[PDB]
Amino acid sequence: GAMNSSNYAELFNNDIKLFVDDTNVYRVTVHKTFEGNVATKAINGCIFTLNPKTGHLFLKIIHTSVWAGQKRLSQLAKWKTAEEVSALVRSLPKEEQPKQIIVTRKAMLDPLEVHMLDFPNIAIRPTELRLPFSAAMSIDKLSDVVMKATEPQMVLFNIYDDWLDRISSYTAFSRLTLLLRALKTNEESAKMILLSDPTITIKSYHLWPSFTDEQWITIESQMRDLILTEYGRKYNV
Amino acid sequence: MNTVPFTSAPIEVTIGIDQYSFNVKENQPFHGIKDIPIGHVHVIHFQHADNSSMRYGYWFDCRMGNFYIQYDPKDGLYKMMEERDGAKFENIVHNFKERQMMVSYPKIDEDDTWYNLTEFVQMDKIRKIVRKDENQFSYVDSSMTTVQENELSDPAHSLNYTVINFKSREAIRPGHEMEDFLDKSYYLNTVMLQGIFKNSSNYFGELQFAFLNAMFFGNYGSSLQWHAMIELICSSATVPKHMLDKLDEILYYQIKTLPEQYSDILLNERVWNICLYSSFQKNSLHNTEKIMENKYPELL
Numbered sequence: 001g002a003m004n005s006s007n008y009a010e011l012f013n014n015d016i017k018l019f020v021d022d023t024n025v026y027r028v029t030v031h032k033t034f035e036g037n038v039a040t041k042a043i044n045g046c047i048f049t050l051n052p053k054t055g056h057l058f059l060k061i062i063h064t065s066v067w068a069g070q071k072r073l074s075q076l077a078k079w080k081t082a083e084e085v086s087a088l089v090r091s092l093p094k095e096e097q098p099k100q101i102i103v104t105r106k107a108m109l110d111p112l113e114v115h116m117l118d119f120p121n122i123a124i125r126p127t128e129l130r131l132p133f134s135a136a137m138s139i140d141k142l143s144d145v146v147m148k149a150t151e152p153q154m155v156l157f158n159i160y161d162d163w164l165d166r167i168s169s170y171t172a173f174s175r176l177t178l179l180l181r182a183l184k185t186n187e188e189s190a191k192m193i194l195l196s197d198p199t200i201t202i203k204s205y206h207l208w209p210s211f212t213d214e215q216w217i218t219i220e221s222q223m224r225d226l227i228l229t230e231y232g233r234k235y236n237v
Numbered sequence: 238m239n240t241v242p243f244t245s246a247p248i249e250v251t252i253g254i255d256q257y258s259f260n261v262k263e264n265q266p267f268h269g270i271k272d273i274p275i276g277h278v279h280v281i282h283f284q285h286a287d288n289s290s291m292r293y294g295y296w297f298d299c300r301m302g303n304f305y306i307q308y309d310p311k312d313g314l315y316k317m318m319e320e321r322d323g324a325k326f327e328n329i330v331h332n333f334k335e336r337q338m339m340v341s342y343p344k345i346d347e348d349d350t351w352y353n354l355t356e357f358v359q360m361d362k363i364r365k366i367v368r369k370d371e372n373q374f375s376y377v378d379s380s381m382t383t384v385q386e387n388e389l390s391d392p393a394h395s396l397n398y399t400v401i402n403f404k405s406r407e408a409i410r411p412g413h414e415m416e417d418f419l420d421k422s423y424y425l426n427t428v429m430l431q432g433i434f435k436n437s438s439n440y441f442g443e444l445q446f447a448f449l450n451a452m453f454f455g456n457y458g459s460s461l462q463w464h465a466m467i468e469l470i471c472s473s474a475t476v477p478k479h480m481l482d483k484l485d486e487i488l489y490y491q492i493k494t495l496p497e498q499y500s501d502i503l504l505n506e507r508v509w510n511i512c513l514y515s516s517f518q519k520n521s522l523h524n525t526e527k528i529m530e531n532k533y534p535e536l537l
């Protein structure tokens with residue numbers, strides 16, 4: 001059934017699973033027309049498909065041409081997501097296909113279930129966790145490849161950089177969700193924290209800065225402060 | 238006009254015949270039902286006074302043979318049987334009629350209710366749903382599972398209704414996933430009407446049979462089937478115009494006949510609100526929508 005705080009370590013067992021987040025698939029800017037009406041302009045989006053055990057991220061870029069001439073785009077976006085996730089699974093060798101796909105939004109359950117009818121043994125599950133994957137587009141290198149795309153494209157990343165050499169996947173996922181929660185609550189501050197010290201760089205093949213273990217503890221403490229703050233600045237506490 | 242005689246009534250029982258019912262006391266001198274209209278299927282059904290559990294009964298068509306009821310004290314129920322000796326049967330019935338030991342099928346002449354509930358029901362096609370090899374009549378009771386339900390555990394004494402499943406490969410063409418799920422016209426018209434039923438009369442017959450088993454026996458799988466067959470039509474953007482008009486009439490008379498106090502269990506809120514207010518056919522069921530809104534506005 002649904003994934004929650006109680007069965008959290010299941011994410012890091014040896015059954016292949018993927019999170020799918022669709023919140024950045026259909027993206028628009030809202031603007032005024034010359035007549036003073038309102039209109040939308042689509043911008044490029046992405047499907048965020050993540051193996052939480054390995055850090056492997058399958059970033060399917062959604063180019064704005066896929067919406068041309070289509071109606072009810074927010075509904076179509078869920079079905080397009082499911083189409084692309086199904087195509088990804090079919091592209092993988094059998095031994096790499098997931099045994100479960102966890103969707104971050106319940107509205108993805110029926111579209112993905114219907115697209116995966118060929119795979120009756122792959123479980124499609126919701127979650128009660130409020131995961132911050134919408135903030136993936138606050139990661140500069142991810143945002144950059146999405147905005148530069150001129151055609152549909154799949155780009156593969158490891159969202160944990162080399163962390164698994166030093167920490168477990170449980171700890172890596174916890175760091176990732178802390179970073180992303182911070183970026184979602186106050187992007188400017190979070191990004192300031194991450195880059196304030198210019199002697200710590202992002203390797204060309206990485207997404208995040210090359211912190212030592214001790215600097216990560218400081219960084220992580222700064223992100224918690226940020227999140228509790230904003231939680232005060234917000235509710236006044 | 239045909240007759241279903243009873244050998245006797247050894248146990249106190251409420252007896253139904255179609256939408257009518259009457260109480261018989263233990264060892265009351267009751268010997269059956271006369272003046273049954275020819276041309277329609279019928280159902281004769283039973284609820285014992287001591288065990289309101291298990292309503293049960295028999296679908297039959299008097300044109301297909303001479304049928305009677307006899308209590309079996311070993312199996313503890315009223316059983317339908319066929320009498321092959323036509324002279325023995327005429328003589329039994331004539332004596333019971335002479336002694337006025339029979340209730341009269343009590344049809345008002347203005348009343349088309351039973352016709353309207355059984356217009357497409359066929360008794361030869363109930364050899365698909367309940368193939369109890371030898372029987373010309375068909376036993377149904379409250380607990381009977383569907384054949385489909387054996388897979389989500391006895392299928393020759395079950396309801397072999399047509400398997401409808403909206404998230405199935407049968408319902409969804411590869412490459413048309415979103416289209417076929419949001420508009421079920423290809424599943425309705427190509428898969429079900431052209432491939433399985435053969436015509437809409439057959440589609441309406443199983444839909445009518447499903448409703449009647451839900452109403453008379455509280456058969457839960459029958460209620461599921463009735464709602465699925467409604468929802469498949471309402472969720473299709475493309476439906477023959479004559480089918481929509483006929484469906485409105487079918488459902489109107491079903492909703493009219495439903496006991497007011499059973500609406501809580503026999504009507505699925507989700508299906509009816511979707512069908513009447515969200516679906517492609519939301520504007521196509523005027524008679525049904527009006528009776529539903531005046532009789533069960535709570536459900537909506």
Ligand SMILES: CC(=O)Nc1ccc([N+](=O)[O-])cc1
Nearest residue numbers: 357358359362439442443446
């Ligand atoms: C496949 C198919 O025609 N089934 C079916 C047709 C009619 C009835 N019926 O009761 O009239 C029951 C089942």
